[model samples]
Target: APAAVDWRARGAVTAVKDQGQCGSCWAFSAIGNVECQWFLAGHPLTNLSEQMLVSCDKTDSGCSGGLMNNAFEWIVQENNGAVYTEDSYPYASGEGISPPCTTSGHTVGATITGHVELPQDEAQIAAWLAVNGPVAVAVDASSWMTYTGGVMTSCVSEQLDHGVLLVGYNDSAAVPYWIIKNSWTTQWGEEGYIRIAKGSNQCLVKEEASSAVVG
Candidate 1:
């Protein structure tokens, strides 16, 4: 049985600059989740390099966006089971060709579990998070390309093109919110993250995956 975990017990939220206009949203989600887990484990909150994923993971489409599960798969299978730091693999704004295979800063501290589908029952979401630290979710954040928000209750488009981390949830406010981390720059949307209505259908992106730190 999966162990119960509460993601909210984790620390403060930090923005991850996804670079100027890279479409490697999946890479950002993957790297951000790992970074968050590292922070939870007493490591200093250091920015990991999403560029490494973009330029290295051939399975992922660089500026065309990609599936989070496929990105995780590439990390575990092809990249010699490694993750890189910002100093070693810095961010680049412009789109570029993939880099040669190298294990310079690849560190594998987490394991990739199989992708899980969320039933309409959103409680299952919290239940899964209770066992897994954070899960990657797909959402119709097309408007998010121009989003500067309070709460995005209305989703103008339902195209699933972006990936985000479902870090935690809070219902203290009049309306509940799902605490999500975005790959956009800090100047955008609540310092690169926003809280959407909890269980709102707008966040129901298909085929979500998450990571668990190896014990």
Candidate 2:
């Protein structure tokens, strides 16, 4: 696994995005994974639409909350794997209210036939990420409200209330952390990202790790 990796440096990751006052972090997490996976699958690193899921994914409660697994299933089973482009569909749920689902008039950016749930072991997850790409994960982000920078060594493992993207890791670091991309915008945390302590499963990061499979 080469001890460390970062997809952002590899150009597979897009810019940090903001979810605003909306609880659409799950959509951002899922779309971020798909965007990187699509790029790694020999396609351009286009920005996919989180608003597509926020508005169209009926399996999840828009602007309220959602699960990454359910969003993936909805994309494959309900949306026929058609992930729309950001410019076409755009994000309209930032005000905490998702507009009605639009069925057409959008350009397809990426597609995924299925998704996979990674093992609940941080080591295995890092190995997979090193070889593959970023991953979608859920975490207890209650304590992340006041985070500023550096590796977060202390956090709770209870209540997985937020979704994020696992972009890379630094096993060689003194604390050994997982670089995570949050949806709270670039002004928060480490430029819309956070590095929580690894191995001990800080914030229950490994409990619900998953990723979309692009081909």
Top-lDDT structure, candidate number: 2
The candidate that achieves the highest TM-score relative to the unseen native structure: 2
- Give one digit per residue, the lDDT tens place, for model 1 in 55-169: 7777877766777677767766776445677767777745444445455555543333333445545567766665556667777777666778776776654577778887776
**How well is each residue in 1-215 modelled by candidate 2, as lDDT tens digits?**
77889999989999999898888889999999999999999998999999999998989988999999999999999988989999999999888889999988999999999999999998999999999999999999988898999899889778999999999999998889999998888988988889899889899999999999987
Evaluated at residue 54, the lDDT of candidate 1 is 78
Model 2: pairs clashing at backbone N, Cα or C within 3 Å: none
**What does the lDDT read for residue 193 in candidate 2?**
86
lDDT, model 2, position 123: 90
Q: What's the lDDT for candidate 1? A: 0.64
Give the Cα lDDT of each candidate.
0.64, 0.92
What TM-score does each of the candidates earn?
Answer: 0.78, 0.98
